[PDB]
UniProtKB/Swiss-Prot annotation, chain A:
Superkingdom of origin organism: Eukaryota
Gene: HPSE
Binding site for heparan sulfate group: D27, A28, N29, T62
Entry protein name: Heparanase 8 kDa subunit
């Protein structure tokens, strides 16, 4: 047969996840793309990202430990 | 070969503005490999950045370091968990001294359990667990260089995630019970993803199953590598085109609520038919308190029909069934919702995500190699109300 019966347990929740349960990253390496500022200004990208709100956006990756803030850089 | 680079105030501004304008909460990873000659974290560069962000009014949360378990291999230096914990305590003091109100700190972003990594996590939590608001770890199923379509469809591969989660929770339970646990960076395959695989419809089985199991096992937040970038596991490519996993994630966001329930298959479980159950996302205007969202994966090569248990057996059900579109089959970069290809209406308009209402009392049909969300309307579940 290909009919499958389901059992549900709905009496009370097993867990509560965050409203931001499905969140996303941007890899730290993207900040080395010379186009970084232009790419992240895309209206279409902003529209897509708003679709996933509420969410965390984590900026990190392997390059996290190879990036240095330069407050004098243009 | 040298990975070291600088970034500017403008890069920080751009990243913060992108998050703010999109309704996202930014978490910024600081560089843990700036070290004093005494083996401590040198906080001078982070201080400059914190001061700048505070001056600008940016509400940002912080991390320190990425996969410290691999520092010895990638950077030639070993930092043990106790020292990393001390470094987080130092960072926590800087955040409290700042004009940030309620800045959160997450760590330590270790790679998935392997004998020695579990020990580093444990020693980190002993020394630094008090100052982090959630424990972060990373997971990938496979090496992107060698992964095959069969691997992406294999219930045995999907199941390897369970043991990895169990190991991490056990470590946290033994040191900080009830500290929140987050997947801080995760996807199908490491090394930039599997080319022609991690960006296809077939990537969705790993993504949806991971969400299901994470919710059921007590992970509070799952951070998908990546929203946007050059890696093959991106949700959105650098032409700004969304991949099938983007639409899967969007439907998940709209339909799946915060209360995790339980669904299982009666009898023989081959693990190719995988089901998860939450209350419906109350933010969704179509639905009301008490509704349930079932989501299901069918890794069989034939259609399966799901029968809802009483009293849900005779409720109105809304179907959101995803299938690949076009001649690439499971490897398509195009996906259909209930027979309609998902595409942006224009650069600023997401398309409608229209349910297909099913005949009440009908069994839920799940074709071979597909996944779907089913909203059970008027389920009137008290736990959800």
């Amino acid at each position: 047969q290909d009919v499958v019966d389901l059992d549900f347990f709905t009496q009370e929740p097993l867990h509560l996840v965050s409203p931001s349960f499905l969140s996303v990253t941007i890899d730290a390496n993207l900040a080395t793309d010379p186009r970084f500022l232009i790419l992240l200004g895309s209206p279409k990208l902003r529209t897509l990202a708003r679709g996933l709100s509420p969410a965390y956006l984590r900026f990190g990756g392997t390059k996290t430990d190879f990036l240095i803030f330069d407050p004098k850089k243009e | 070969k040298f990975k070291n680079s600088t970034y500017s105030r403008s890069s920080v501004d751009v990243l913060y503005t992108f998050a703010k304008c999109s309704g996202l909460d930014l978490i910024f990873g600081l560089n843990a490999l700036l070290r004093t000659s005494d083996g401590q974290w040198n906080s001078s560069n982070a201080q400059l950045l914190l001061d700048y962000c505070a001056s600008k009014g940016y509400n940002i949360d912080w991390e320190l370091g990425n996969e410290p378990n691999s520092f010895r291999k990638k950077a030639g230096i070993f930092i043990n968990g106790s020292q990393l914990g001390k470094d987080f305590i130092h960072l926590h003091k800087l955040l409290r001294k700042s004009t940030f109100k309620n800045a959160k700190l997450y760590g330590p972003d270790v790679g998935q359990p392997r004998g020695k990594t579990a020990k580093m996590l444990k020693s980190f939590l002993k020394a630094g667990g008090e100052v982090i608001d959630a424990v972060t770890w990373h997971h990938y199923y496979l090496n992107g260089r060698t992964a095959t379509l069969e691997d992406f469809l294999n219930p045995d591969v999907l199941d390897t995630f369970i043991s990895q989660v169990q190991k991490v929770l056990q470590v946290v339970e033994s040191t900080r019970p009830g500290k929140k646990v987050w997947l801080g960076e995760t996807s199908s395959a490491y090394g930039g993803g599997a080319p022609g695989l991690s960006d296809t419809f077939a990537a969705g089985f790993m993504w949806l199953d991971k969400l299901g199991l994470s919710a059921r096992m007590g992970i509070e937040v799952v951070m998908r590598q990546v929203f946007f970038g050059a890696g093959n596991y991106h949700l959105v490519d650098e032409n700004f085109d969304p991949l099938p996993d983007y639409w899967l994630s969007l439907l998940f966001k709209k339909l799946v609520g915060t209360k995790v329930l339980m669904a299982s298959v009666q009898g023989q479980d081959r693990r190719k038919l995988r089901v998860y159950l939450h209350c419906t996302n109350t933010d969704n205007p179509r639905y009301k308190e008490g509704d349930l969202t079932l989501y299901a994966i069918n890794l069989h090569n034939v259609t399966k029909y799901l029968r809802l248990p009483y009293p849900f057996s005779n409720k109105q059900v809304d179907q959101y069934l995803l299938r690949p579109h076009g001649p690439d089959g499971l490897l398509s970069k195009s996906v259909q919702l209930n027979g309609q290809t998902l595409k942006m209406v224009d650069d600023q308009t997401l398309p409608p995500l229209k349910p297909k209402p099913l005949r009440p009392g009908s069994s839920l049909g799940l074709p071979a190699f597909s996944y779907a969300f089913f909203v059970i309307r008027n389920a009137k579940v008290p736990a959800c109300i």
